[PDB]
């Protein structure tokens, strides 16, 4: 009840509500809170604790030893950042449940798909460093040796910079996939400038092609994964998700009891 | 707690809303302001009257049209509730004012760029030719008042013969205008004057006739009441100032945050060790 007190006067949760319920930020909030609840009641069974754990783990290693404490900063606990993860997973489950892929959808996926290749990567923090490296590889230093000695991708460095990837591989920069796929077997890239998911990560890279793969004609060979890429595409359209969310709110018979949020769903329940 | 909404298996209560909202940064700031408002209201509230609330409401209302009434429903406010906001800011500023102790220096600064009240006439034109034409007219003769009535696009002043009274502090008059105006001797007509603003960006032109200029002289004591005013208004907008004052009043009110989720909400005002 009491959020704070002072000489003559108390501020309650109720007093806080009456103010907050006006704020735009809280319009958006109660919207999301309704959406999450509806999708959780419907698609929540499709999401497992294992997958929540998995997603937590993923993002945690991808965000430092400080993550634990970066959540204190964002007001979250562990168990409550999971709750957010569990909300997003059931949400996307729901969207996925409304995907019906078309021969067009597939064709679009295809047009820019590349199948899995084996390659070796050296990553450097400098431009000279990578320029210097490419000359080395030109001379004929063993790739794996240069990789072992130099690559700053500690992920791959001990293995001779061996990576496997396709057009969809997320951990690998776009400028890299771009250059790599061009290469014939045993051919070494030029230097490659890029940006990473960081927001400023201006890395450089050299690449050796181990096993390139041509995709051919009959797209049916890669139909299982084309279905996938295609599905991921739709899940990012707002025309799509708007519609889907629209449908599910209708399905769940959502009734706004507080006049203050009477308008909160209007973005969906409309023509 | 009340239900905010319901659906097939599931209710969202105010309580459920709270536990989520109390994390949001927006709501950090909110409970901050709400604590500050309450503290100043308990202390300086008597210094604010319903009349002054009404006054402030009225002011802003006429300054927005038939829009306003309905622009508040848009911002989630009622009339009764927008008043409560006005009453919160008035008691806030009351409190700040209560901590102003002006210095000889404060006054001196006010003085340095003060000009006392002058009587003048202003014609506003939306063209450059129009105003160039006008200045020749005033040069010829014809009553200033007449030219003002016929031409000035400032419907504010147009019916009065363009009579304005103002000083250095008058906000409704463009600074490039006050600049040119104060230079003028009595009965002297300005040159054309280009300027800005109005609707946050524009290019108006102005002609000015000086009716009664006033020199400020030496003894700054003559204008002590209004220098104190300018000075007071200056302090009320210093952050170092207001921070300190708000700091003090929270201390005075022995504010205790009962929900760990806002434990940090007053920290901007809790001055501590700095070496």
Author numbering:
A (entry chain B): 30 to 300
B (entry chain A): 29 to 303
Sentences reproduced from the published study:
PpiC is a membrane‐bound lipoprotein of E. faecium endowed with both a peptidyl‐prolyl isomerase and a foldase activity, and plays a key role in assisting the folding of many secreted enterococcal proteins. It is located at the membrane–wall interface, therefore easily accessible to inhibitors and to the immune system and an ideal target for drug and vaccine development. We previously identified PpiC as an important cross‐protective vaccine antigen.
To gain a better understanding of the PpiC biological role in E. faecium survival, we determined the crystal structure of PpiC and investigated its biophysical properties. Consistent with PpiC's folding activity, the biological assembly of PpiC is a bowl‐shaped structure containing two parvulin‐type peptidyl‐prolyl cis/trans isomerase domains. We also dissected the role of N‐ and C‐terminal regions of the molecule in its dimerisation, an event which is predicted to play an important role in the folding of client proteins.
